[model samples]
Target: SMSVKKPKRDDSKDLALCSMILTEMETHEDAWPFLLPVNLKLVPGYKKVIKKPMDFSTIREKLSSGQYPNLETFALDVRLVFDNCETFNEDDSDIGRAGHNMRKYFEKKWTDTFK
Candidate 1:
Protein backbone atom coordinates (compact mmCIF):
# COMPACT_ATOMS: atom_id res chain seq x y z
CA SER A 1 0.00 0.00 0.00
CA MET A 2 0.29 3.39 -1.03
CA SER A 3 -0.25 5.46 2.09
CA VAL A 4 -0.99 8.55 0.12
CA LYS A 5 -4.62 8.53 -0.87
CA LYS A 6 -7.31 6.12 0.30
CA PRO A 7 -10.83 6.58 -1.06
CA LYS A 8 -14.28 4.97 -1.27
CA ARG A 9 -17.26 2.85 -3.85
CA ASP A 10 -20.85 1.62 -7.59
CA ASP A 11 -23.28 1.32 -10.50
CA SER A 12 -23.72 1.76 -14.22
CA LYS A 13 -24.07 -1.36 -16.34
CA ASP A 14 -20.87 -0.53 -18.17
CA LEU A 15 -19.14 -0.11 -14.83
CA ALA A 16 -19.97 -3.64 -13.80
CA LEU A 17 -18.49 -4.89 -17.04
CA CYS A 18 -15.52 -2.57 -16.55
CA SER A 19 -15.00 -4.13 -13.16
CA MET A 20 -14.61 -7.55 -14.72
CA ILE A 21 -12.15 -6.34 -17.34
CA LEU A 22 -10.18 -4.27 -14.84
CA THR A 23 -9.77 -7.19 -12.45
CA GLU A 24 -8.25 -9.25 -15.21
CA MET A 25 -5.87 -6.39 -15.99
CA GLU A 26 -4.84 -6.18 -12.35
CA THR A 27 -4.13 -9.89 -12.34
CA HIS A 28 -2.25 -9.80 -15.64
CA GLU A 29 1.35 -10.96 -15.26
CA ASP A 30 2.71 -8.08 -17.34
CA ALA A 31 0.77 -5.58 -15.31
CA TRP A 32 3.24 -5.11 -12.48
CA PRO A 33 4.52 -1.69 -13.55
CA PHE A 34 1.03 -0.47 -14.25
CA LEU A 35 -0.74 -1.79 -11.17
CA LEU A 36 0.11 1.47 -9.50
CA PRO A 37 1.41 4.88 -10.48
CA VAL A 38 5.12 5.30 -11.01
CA ASN A 39 7.03 6.05 -7.82
CA LEU A 40 8.51 9.55 -7.96
CA LYS A 41 11.53 8.76 -5.82
CA LEU A 42 12.65 5.67 -7.68
CA VAL A 43 11.69 6.71 -11.21
CA PRO A 44 13.45 9.94 -12.08
CA GLY A 45 12.44 12.48 -14.74
CA TYR A 46 9.09 10.74 -15.02
CA LYS A 47 6.99 13.41 -13.38
CA LYS A 48 8.44 16.10 -15.58
CA VAL A 49 8.20 14.13 -18.81
CA ILE A 50 4.94 12.32 -18.26
CA LYS A 51 2.60 15.04 -17.17
CA LYS A 52 -0.35 12.77 -16.56
CA PRO A 53 0.74 9.64 -14.79
CA MET A 54 -2.01 7.06 -14.77
CA ASP A 55 -2.46 3.47 -13.63
CA PHE A 56 -4.98 0.73 -12.92
CA SER A 57 -5.29 1.67 -9.26
CA THR A 58 -6.17 5.23 -10.17
CA ILE A 59 -8.52 4.09 -12.90
CA ARG A 60 -10.38 1.81 -10.54
CA GLU A 61 -10.95 4.62 -8.12
CA LYS A 62 -12.00 6.98 -10.88
CA LEU A 63 -14.48 4.49 -12.19
CA SER A 64 -15.93 3.95 -8.74
CA SER A 65 -16.07 7.67 -8.12
CA GLY A 66 -18.10 8.13 -11.33
CA GLN A 67 -15.44 10.34 -12.85
CA TYR A 68 -15.94 8.41 -16.04
CA PRO A 69 -19.10 9.32 -17.85
CA ASN A 70 -19.01 6.20 -19.98
CA LEU A 71 -16.94 3.23 -20.94
CA GLU A 72 -15.27 5.20 -23.71
CA THR A 73 -14.04 7.75 -21.19
CA PHE A 74 -13.01 4.97 -18.85
CA ALA A 75 -11.10 3.27 -21.65
CA LEU A 76 -9.12 6.45 -22.31
CA ASP A 77 -7.45 6.28 -18.91
CA VAL A 78 -6.47 2.66 -19.49
CA ARG A 79 -4.75 3.65 -22.71
CA LEU A 80 -3.11 6.57 -20.94
CA VAL A 81 -1.43 4.21 -18.50
CA PHE A 82 0.12 2.21 -21.30
CA ASP A 83 0.95 5.29 -23.34
CA ASN A 84 2.84 6.77 -20.45
CA CYS A 85 4.73 3.52 -20.08
CA GLU A 86 5.91 3.60 -23.66
CA THR A 87 6.86 7.24 -23.46
CA PHE A 88 9.19 6.68 -20.52
CA ASN A 89 10.66 3.19 -20.64
CA GLU A 90 12.73 1.97 -23.54
CA ASP A 91 10.55 0.02 -25.94
CA ASP A 92 12.74 -3.06 -25.56
CA SER A 93 13.23 -2.74 -21.83
CA ASP A 94 11.41 -5.03 -19.44
CA ILE A 95 8.97 -2.37 -18.28
CA GLY A 96 8.22 -1.01 -21.72
CA ARG A 97 8.00 -4.48 -23.22
CA ALA A 98 5.59 -5.50 -20.53
CA GLY A 99 3.56 -2.39 -21.28
CA HIS A 100 3.15 -3.47 -24.86
CA ASN A 101 1.95 -6.87 -23.73
CA MET A 102 -0.41 -5.33 -21.23
CA ARG A 103 -1.77 -2.84 -23.76
CA LYS A 104 -2.41 -5.59 -26.26
CA TYR A 105 -4.30 -7.60 -23.71
CA PHE A 106 -6.24 -4.54 -22.57
CA GLU A 107 -7.38 -3.59 -26.07
CA LYS A 108 -8.18 -7.19 -26.92
CA LYS A 109 -10.15 -7.58 -23.75
CA TRP A 110 -11.96 -4.30 -24.17
CA THR A 111 -12.77 -4.90 -27.81
CA ASP A 112 -13.76 -8.51 -27.31
CA THR A 113 -15.89 -7.57 -24.33
CA PHE A 114 -17.31 -4.19 -25.29
CA LYS A 115 -16.51 -3.33 -28.86
Candidate 2:
Protein backbone atom coordinates (compact mmCIF):
# COMPACT_ATOMS: atom_id res chain seq x y z
CA SER A 1 0.00 0.00 0.00
CA MET A 2 1.17 3.50 -0.76
CA SER A 3 1.63 6.08 1.96
CA VAL A 4 -0.77 8.69 0.63
CA LYS A 5 -0.85 11.92 2.59
CA LYS A 6 -3.98 12.56 4.59
CA PRO A 7 -5.97 15.55 3.39
CA LYS A 8 -6.37 18.49 5.73
CA ARG A 9 -9.82 20.05 5.95
CA ASP A 10 -8.24 23.40 5.09
CA ASP A 11 -7.21 22.02 1.70
CA SER A 12 -9.19 22.63 -1.48
CA LYS A 13 -12.61 21.11 -1.99
CA ASP A 14 -11.09 18.92 -4.68
CA LEU A 15 -8.86 17.35 -2.09
CA ALA A 16 -11.82 16.73 0.17
CA LEU A 17 -13.80 15.24 -2.69
CA CYS A 18 -10.94 13.02 -3.76
CA SER A 19 -10.33 11.90 -0.22
CA MET A 20 -14.03 11.17 0.28
CA ILE A 21 -14.25 9.24 -2.96
CA LEU A 22 -11.14 7.20 -2.31
CA THR A 23 -12.12 6.49 1.25
CA GLU A 24 -15.52 5.34 0.03
CA MET A 25 -14.03 3.20 -2.72
CA GLU A 26 -11.52 1.55 -0.43
CA THR A 27 -14.12 0.83 2.22
CA HIS A 28 -16.76 -0.51 -0.17
CA GLU A 29 -16.05 -1.97 -3.58
CA ASP A 30 -19.59 -1.80 -4.94
CA ALA A 31 -19.03 1.95 -5.45
CA TRP A 32 -16.00 1.27 -7.59
CA PRO A 33 -15.88 0.49 -11.31
CA PHE A 34 -14.73 -3.13 -11.32
CA LEU A 35 -15.97 -5.64 -8.76
CA LEU A 36 -15.49 -9.35 -8.18
CA PRO A 37 -18.30 -11.81 -7.64
CA VAL A 38 -17.20 -12.37 -4.06
CA ASN A 39 -17.17 -8.64 -3.42
CA LEU A 40 -20.76 -8.37 -4.58
CA LYS A 41 -21.76 -11.17 -2.23
CA LEU A 42 -20.06 -9.54 0.71
CA VAL A 43 -21.81 -6.19 0.36
CA PRO A 44 -25.54 -6.72 0.77
CA GLY A 45 -25.29 -8.74 3.97
CA TYR A 46 -23.08 -6.18 5.67
CA LYS A 47 -24.91 -3.16 4.32
CA LYS A 48 -28.19 -4.62 5.48
CA VAL A 49 -27.08 -4.09 9.03
CA ILE A 50 -26.04 -0.50 8.48
CA LYS A 51 -28.93 0.34 6.22
CA LYS A 52 -31.71 -0.91 8.36
CA PRO A 53 -34.82 1.27 8.23
CA MET A 54 -33.83 3.87 10.84
CA ASP A 55 -30.22 4.09 9.81
CA PHE A 56 -31.19 4.41 6.17
CA SER A 57 -33.65 7.18 6.89
CA THR A 58 -31.19 9.17 8.99
CA ILE A 59 -28.45 9.04 6.40
CA ARG A 60 -30.82 9.84 3.61
CA GLU A 61 -32.11 12.86 5.47
CA LYS A 62 -28.63 14.10 6.27
CA LEU A 63 -27.45 13.64 2.71
CA SER A 64 -30.52 15.15 1.19
CA SER A 65 -30.20 18.14 3.50
CA GLY A 66 -26.49 18.55 2.77
CA GLN A 67 -25.72 18.56 6.46
CA TYR A 68 -22.63 16.46 6.79
CA PRO A 69 -21.14 17.75 10.03
CA ASN A 70 -17.61 16.63 9.23
CA LEU A 71 -16.53 15.08 5.98
CA GLU A 72 -13.58 13.32 7.63
CA THR A 73 -15.84 11.93 10.33
CA PHE A 74 -18.16 10.60 7.64
CA ALA A 75 -15.22 8.99 5.88
CA LEU A 76 -14.05 7.44 9.13
CA ASP A 77 -17.50 6.02 9.76
CA VAL A 78 -17.32 4.28 6.41
CA ARG A 79 -13.86 2.95 7.17
CA LEU A 80 -15.07 1.72 10.55
CA VAL A 81 -18.00 -0.03 8.89
CA PHE A 82 -15.62 -1.82 6.58
CA ASP A 83 -13.56 -2.85 9.57
CA ASN A 84 -16.72 -4.09 11.22
CA CYS A 85 -17.66 -5.99 8.10
CA GLU A 86 -14.26 -7.64 8.08
CA THR A 87 -15.13 -9.00 11.50
CA PHE A 88 -18.46 -10.34 10.41
CA ASN A 89 -19.23 -14.10 10.42
CA GLU A 90 -17.21 -14.54 13.60
CA ASP A 91 -13.70 -13.57 12.47
CA ASP A 92 -13.68 -15.81 9.42
CA SER A 93 -10.31 -15.55 7.71
CA ASP A 94 -11.73 -16.18 4.26
CA ILE A 95 -14.15 -13.28 4.65
CA GLY A 96 -11.38 -11.04 5.99
CA ARG A 97 -9.18 -11.80 2.98
CA ALA A 98 -12.07 -11.29 0.63
CA GLY A 99 -12.80 -7.89 2.19
CA HIS A 100 -9.13 -6.93 1.93
CA ASN A 101 -8.90 -7.86 -1.73
CA MET A 102 -12.12 -6.07 -2.53
CA ARG A 103 -10.78 -2.93 -0.83
CA LYS A 104 -7.51 -3.21 -2.76
CA TYR A 105 -9.38 -3.68 -6.03
CA PHE A 106 -11.36 -0.52 -5.37
CA GLU A 107 -8.24 1.51 -4.54
CA LYS A 108 -6.60 0.41 -7.78
CA LYS A 109 -9.71 1.09 -9.77
CA TRP A 110 -10.05 4.58 -8.27
CA THR A 111 -6.50 5.44 -9.29
CA ASP A 112 -7.08 4.18 -12.81
CA THR A 113 -10.54 5.64 -13.11
CA PHE A 114 -9.54 9.13 -12.02
CA LYS A 115 -6.26 9.31 -13.86
Candidate 3:
Protein backbone atom coordinates (compact mmCIF):
# COMPACT_ATOMS: atom_id res chain seq x y z
CA SER A 1 0.00 0.00 0.00
CA MET A 2 0.99 3.63 -0.52
CA SER A 3 0.87 6.47 1.96
CA VAL A 4 -2.07 8.81 1.51
CA LYS A 5 -2.60 12.35 2.69
CA LYS A 6 -6.06 13.04 4.05
CA PRO A 7 -7.76 16.39 4.44
CA LYS A 8 -6.54 18.11 7.58
CA ARG A 9 -8.95 18.94 10.39
CA ASP A 10 -6.44 21.45 11.78
CA ASP A 11 -8.10 24.32 9.99
CA SER A 12 -11.16 23.86 12.14
CA LYS A 13 -9.01 24.03 15.25
CA ASP A 14 -7.36 27.17 13.93
CA LEU A 15 -10.69 28.90 13.44
CA ALA A 16 -11.84 27.89 16.88
CA LEU A 17 -8.66 29.20 18.44
CA CYS A 18 -8.87 32.43 16.47
CA SER A 19 -12.45 32.91 17.59
CA MET A 20 -11.41 32.46 21.19
CA ILE A 21 -8.68 35.08 20.79
CA LEU A 22 -11.15 37.50 19.26
CA THR A 23 -13.62 36.91 22.06
CA GLU A 24 -10.99 37.89 24.59
CA MET A 25 -10.11 41.00 22.59
CA GLU A 26 -13.75 42.03 22.35
CA THR A 27 -14.12 41.82 26.10
CA HIS A 28 -10.95 43.70 26.99
CA GLU A 29 -11.44 47.09 28.65
CA ASP A 30 -9.27 48.81 26.06
CA ALA A 31 -11.37 47.26 23.31
CA TRP A 32 -14.07 49.94 23.37
CA PRO A 33 -12.66 52.01 20.54
CA PHE A 34 -12.30 48.98 18.27
CA LEU A 35 -15.63 47.42 19.23
CA LEU A 36 -17.64 48.99 16.41
CA PRO A 37 -17.31 51.02 13.30
CA VAL A 38 -16.70 54.70 13.68
CA ASN A 39 -19.65 57.00 13.17
CA LEU A 40 -18.95 58.77 9.93
CA LYS A 41 -21.34 61.57 10.76
CA LEU A 42 -19.93 62.09 14.23
CA VAL A 43 -16.34 61.91 13.04
CA PRO A 44 -16.24 63.69 9.76
CA GLY A 45 -13.23 63.27 7.39
CA TYR A 46 -12.63 59.74 8.65
CA LYS A 47 -14.07 58.41 5.45
CA LYS A 48 -11.43 60.20 3.43
CA VAL A 49 -8.50 59.29 5.65
CA ILE A 50 -8.96 55.60 6.40
CA LYS A 51 -8.53 53.41 3.36
CA LYS A 52 -9.76 50.19 4.95
CA PRO A 53 -11.59 50.48 8.23
CA MET A 54 -11.70 47.50 10.57
CA ASP A 55 -13.41 46.80 13.91
CA PHE A 56 -14.17 43.91 16.24
CA SER A 57 -17.83 43.74 15.19
CA THR A 58 -16.93 43.46 11.54
CA ILE A 59 -14.17 40.95 12.29
CA ARG A 60 -16.60 38.81 14.24
CA GLU A 61 -19.07 38.79 11.38
CA LYS A 62 -16.38 37.84 8.90
CA LEU A 63 -15.12 35.00 11.05
CA SER A 64 -18.65 33.77 11.72
CA SER A 65 -19.30 33.77 8.01
CA GLY A 66 -16.08 31.80 7.35
CA GLN A 67 -14.62 34.56 5.24
CA TYR A 68 -11.18 34.00 6.65
CA PRO A 69 -9.40 30.96 5.23
CA ASN A 70 -6.63 30.80 7.83
CA LEU A 71 -5.43 32.30 11.12
CA GLU A 72 -3.06 34.75 9.44
CA THR A 73 -5.85 36.47 7.50
CA PHE A 74 -7.84 36.93 10.69
CA ALA A 75 -4.76 38.37 12.34
CA LEU A 76 -4.46 40.85 9.48
CA ASP A 77 -7.79 42.45 10.31
CA VAL A 78 -6.88 42.62 13.99
CA ARG A 79 -3.74 44.52 13.11
CA LEU A 80 -5.65 46.76 10.74
CA VAL A 81 -8.02 47.90 13.49
CA PHE A 82 -5.12 49.40 15.40
CA ASP A 83 -3.33 50.69 12.32
CA ASN A 84 -6.43 52.61 11.36
CA CYS A 85 -6.76 53.91 14.89
CA GLU A 86 -3.22 55.22 14.85
CA THR A 87 -3.70 56.86 11.48
CA PHE A 88 -6.80 58.71 12.64
CA ASN A 89 -6.06 59.43 16.30
CA GLU A 90 -3.37 61.22 18.24
CA ASP A 91 -1.13 59.00 20.43
CA ASP A 92 -2.02 61.03 23.56
CA SER A 93 -5.78 60.71 22.98
CA ASP A 94 -8.15 58.21 24.63
CA ILE A 95 -8.85 56.03 21.62
CA GLY A 96 -5.20 56.14 20.71
CA ARG A 97 -4.12 54.82 24.09
CA ALA A 98 -6.73 52.12 23.98
CA GLY A 99 -5.65 51.06 20.51
CA HIS A 100 -2.02 50.79 21.60
CA ASN A 101 -2.83 48.74 24.64
CA MET A 102 -5.25 46.48 22.78
CA ARG A 103 -2.65 45.90 20.08
CA LYS A 104 -0.12 44.87 22.68
CA TYR A 105 -2.65 42.50 24.17
CA PHE A 106 -3.27 40.83 20.82
CA GLU A 107 0.43 40.51 20.01
CA LYS A 108 1.17 38.89 23.34
CA LYS A 109 -1.73 36.46 22.99
CA TRP A 110 -0.77 35.62 19.44
CA THR A 111 2.79 34.79 20.42
CA ASP A 112 1.67 32.72 23.36
CA THR A 113 -0.90 30.85 21.29
CA PHE A 114 1.25 30.17 18.23
CA LYS A 115 4.87 30.21 19.36
Off by over 4 Å in 1: 1-12
Consecutive 10-residue window with the lowest summed lDDT within model 3: 1-10
lDDT of 1: 0.87
Residue-wise C-alpha lDDT for candidate 2, range 1-115, written one tens digit per residue: 3987776446336345645554555355343322221243556665455442222233334444666665544444444434554555344565566556655664565456444
Can you write out model 1's per-residue Cα lDDT over 4-52, one digit (the tens) per residue? 7655322346789998999999998888898887898887798799999
Ranking by lDDT: 3, 1, 2
Error in Å for residue 1 of model 3 = 24
lDDT of 3 at 36: 91
Prediction-by-prediction clash tally = 0, 0, 0
Could you tell me which 10 consecutive residues in candidate 1 have the lowest summed lDDT?
4-13
- Most lDDT-accurate candidate: 3
RMSD to the true structure for each prediction, in A, is: 10.4, 10.2, 3.5
Candidate 2 — which residues are off by over 4 angstroms?
Answer: 1-64, 90-95, 102-115
For model 3, the superposed segments whose C-alpha errors exceed 4 Å read 1-9
Name the TM-score of candidate 3.
Answer: 0.89
Model with the higher TM-score, candidate 1 or 3: 3
TM-score of each: 0.86, 0.38, 0.89
Clashing pairs in 2: none
